[PDB]
Write a protein that binds this ligand. Sequence first.
Ligand SMILES: OC[C@H]1O[C@@H](O[C@@H]2[C@@H](O)[C@@H](O)O[C@H](CO)[C@H]2O)[C@H](O)[C@@H](O)[C@@H]1O
Ligand SMILES: OC[C@H]1O[C@H](O)[C@H](O)[C@@H](O)[C@@H]1O
Ligand SMILES: [Ca+2]
Length: 263
Amino acid sequence: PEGVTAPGNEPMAIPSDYKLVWADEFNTPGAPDAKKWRYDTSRNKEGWYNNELQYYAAGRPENVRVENGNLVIETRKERLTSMADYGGQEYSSGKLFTQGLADWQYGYVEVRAKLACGKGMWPAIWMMASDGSTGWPALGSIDIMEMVAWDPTTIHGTIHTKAYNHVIHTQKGSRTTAADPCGQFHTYSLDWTKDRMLIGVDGHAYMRFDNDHKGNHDTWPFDSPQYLILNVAIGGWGGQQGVDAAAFPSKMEVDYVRVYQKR
Ligand SMILES: OC[C@H]1O[C@@H](O[C@@H]2[C@@H](O)[C@@H](O)O[C@H](CO)[C@H]2O)[C@H](O)[C@@H](O)[C@@H]1O
Ligand SMILES: OC[C@H]1O[C@H](O)[C@H](O)[C@@H](O)[C@@H]1O
Ligand SMILES: [Ca+2]
């Protein structure tokens, strides 16, 4: 298959000698836990990357709230023109991350989620290196789950490095089919060790990316902590077959995040 550059085909499970080090169960309705999550508003004025169309609203229950035991990130077609950091965007959405609060070097990450559909929507569950000194894409980024809702049953798992990234079409990725990802929950899983990453759905790794063992940061920048990111972008990749006005509002629901690490 054309762009499968990091194929996987093996089971994944929480190793027996790993412990739970961090979780959000999202069982307390209201605002996300401020000891666990912060809002990224860093590019609201300038505009987000990837020709994205959304404004990411902080402190707005209409975009980001915990209810019925899930985190909800909801896209809306509206101009939040009263925000000081407004960048002319036609849509609102949310982006949460654990940056500065919680980060991990190696481990087993599980995110149970139901995804946001409608042509335009680009839900993501991903990580970035806590030390961004080398910039993107050198620092290393981990896409545990991306979906673009013009192809809503296709789940993409991808890593980006300096040598291996989407700007030069060398990203290391795979994809699999999941049943109705916007109408039912699935478990999106990362098993990250010093020697390889597995990315999967419901216990099956469809992606594997190996440490080449050359000690080259350009091919393996993953020996340092990564923080977790939950977002629903609009346009860019999500807009390849257009943005449908009728598709707003749309939500991604996250039942839980669980992170495990070797004891
Ligand atoms: O903001 C850091 C970096 O993000 C890129 O896009 C990422 C993509 O590389 C991958 O990691 O998936 C996530 C979630 O779908 C995208 O936001 C941008 O291409 C880049 O310009 C930016 O520096
Ligand atoms: O356009 C950016 C997207 O491009 C790709 O095809 C990658 O798999 C994905 O991780 C990235 O976010
Ligand atoms: Ca829950």
